[PDB]
């Protein structure tokens, strides 16, 4: 059950300058780059292109090209449009992929957050602005939605493109995907929070608890998970205990890539 | 200048067929426009084409449009004294009012009656 | 949808003031100025997306542009110069790509 994102941030500081980037997500593991500085989209993995043939993802990336100036642009004239109404600095987010469900079932998105905050939306055959949106909006989506040809390529890249050659990938990358990284874990302690940290584990679902033999002691506290460079995570698991009670406690780790054999490291 | 028309300029004589080319290298292209201009008058939309290899007909002109090679011819069939006009291409970059238009310089046509 | 242009042909002094209106009761937002110049395409001057709005094109040098109401929309001249002397055409359009040109104004900057 795979989430496929591709995430573009722009930030236009005033009339004259701007930069968009993006990043694209498979679940967890990045599987594209397109910096502002690069003409090109950089693939991240091998498996990056998927199962389309050179001709079809010069095609797509063409398309990509192509959108980057023009999106540019259109922000800059919808600006002036709606002056003095909106004002730069502006920040626009696009977040838009599909959800690839078993079978041939899947559901697409493509929605757009101005100032950090979610507005719009490309729903059935066109763009509409969301619950909370402001009124002013209307006018850009009127815009926006007398531009037929964007449509048309929009409605076919998020119904026929995006689950198409996000099959594609699941299959190509498929050993990275499935991969099996063993956790890590050693013991510390601070004014007395004792810290058991586990790092290095691929995939991310993984079990921490601090123990007593068999108690699981209920004050643990988990953090969050964090990544690692090499596409690893870090998680740790803080508890709460009296200077003398240290001694019989351990921190027990329960992952995927340990067949069942649990790391136990006591203090 | 990001659109080129051909011939510059060109005499026929009534009745005979002409053909008229626009090149260009505007991107993106999402349709292109035919104009008749008089002399010291304005500009008359003959046709627009929209599609990615495009055809269409307005009674004695027809057109076609190749996005791939960005290339649109303007035919006139049996040419009439009135056709003397000069003929303009024009690129619309946006399916919207977005969109910024690209002249060509024109066609200077003159038909001997 | 219609479009018209006033005065349609003017002729004027080197340093004096000229202003050309373009008038529109089609209720479109967006209205547009050109020149044409022989050996040239239309070229954008200045442009306007509603009361107020006044827009840089591609040339707006030597002119300025105003926007006092839906209807109207003027490109000013505050000096001349022989080098304006041109044919000028303005358009209007909602949301859509169409510009709807009016009849065109014949200017002469004459020394």
């Known amino acids: 059950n795979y989430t496929f994102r591709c995430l573009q941030m722009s930030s236009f500081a005033n009339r004259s300058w701007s930069r968009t980037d993006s990043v694209v997500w498979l679940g967890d593991l990045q599987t594209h780059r397109w910096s502002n500085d690069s003409a090109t989209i950089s693939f991240t993995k091998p498996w990056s292109q998927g199962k389309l043939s050179n001709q079809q993802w010069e095609k797509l990336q063409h398309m990509f090209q192509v959108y980057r100036v023009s999106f540019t642009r259109d922000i800059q004239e919808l600006v002036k449009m709606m002056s003095p109404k909106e004002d730069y600095p502006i920040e626009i987010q696009l977040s838009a992929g599909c959800e690839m469900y078993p079978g041939n079932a899947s559901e697409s998105f493509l929605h757009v957050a101005f100032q950090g905050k979610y507005v719009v939306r490309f729903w059935g055959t066109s763009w509409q602005t969301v619950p909370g949106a402001p009124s002013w909006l209307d006018l850009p989506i009127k815009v926006l939605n007398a531009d037929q040809g964007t449509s048309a390529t929009v409605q076919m890249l998020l119904n026929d493109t995006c689950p198409l050659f996000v099959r594609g990938l699941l299959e190509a990358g498929k050993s990275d995907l499935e991969k099996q990284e063993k956790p890590v874990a050693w013991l510390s302690s601070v004014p007395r929070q004792l810290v058991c940290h586990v790092s290095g584990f691929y995939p991310k679902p993984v079990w921490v608890m601090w123990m007593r033999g068999d108690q699981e002691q209920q004050g643990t506290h988990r953090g969050d998970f964090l990544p690692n460079a090499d596409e690893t995570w870090y998680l740790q698991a803080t508890l709460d205990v009296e200077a003398g009670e240290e001694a019989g406690l351990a921190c027990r780790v329960k992952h995927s890539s340990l067949g069942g054999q649990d790391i136990i490291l006591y203090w | 200048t990001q659109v080129e028309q051909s011939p510059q300029s060109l005499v026929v004589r009534q009745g005979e067929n002409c053909v008229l080319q626009?090149?260009?290298?505007?991107?993106?292209?999402?349709?292109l426009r035919w104009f008749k201009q008089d002399t010291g008058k304005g500009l008359v939309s003959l046709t627009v084409?929209?599609?990615?290899?495009d055809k269409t007909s307005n009674g004695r002109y027809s057109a076609t449009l190749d996005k791939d090679a960005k290339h649109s011819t303007l035919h006139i069939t049996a040419t009439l004294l009135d056709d003397t006009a000069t003929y303009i291409c024009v690129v619309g970059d946006r399916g919207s009012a977005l969109g910024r238009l690209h002249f060509g310089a024109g066609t200077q046509l003159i038909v001997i009656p | 949808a219609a479009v018209t242009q006033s005065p349609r042909n003017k002729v004027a002094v080197t340093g004096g003031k000229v202003t050309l209106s373009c008038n529109q009761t089609?209720?479109?937002?967006?209205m547009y100025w050109y020149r044409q110049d022989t050996g040239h395409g239309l070229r954008l001057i200045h442009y306007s997306y509603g009361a107020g709005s006044t827009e840089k094109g591609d040339i707006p040098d030597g002119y300025k542009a105003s926007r006092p109401s839906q209807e109207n929309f003027s490109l000013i001249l505050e000096l001349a110069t022989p080098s304006q002397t041109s044919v000028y055409f303005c358009?209007?359009?909602?949301?859509?790509?169409?510009?709807?040109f009016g009849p065109g104004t014949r200017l002469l900057v004459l020394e």
């Open positions: 358009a209007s359009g909602d949301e859509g790509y169409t510009q709807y």
């Open positions: 089609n209720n479109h937002n967006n």
């Open positions: 084409l929209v599609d990615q290899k």
């Open positions: 626009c090149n260009y290298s505007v991107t993106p292209d999402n349709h």
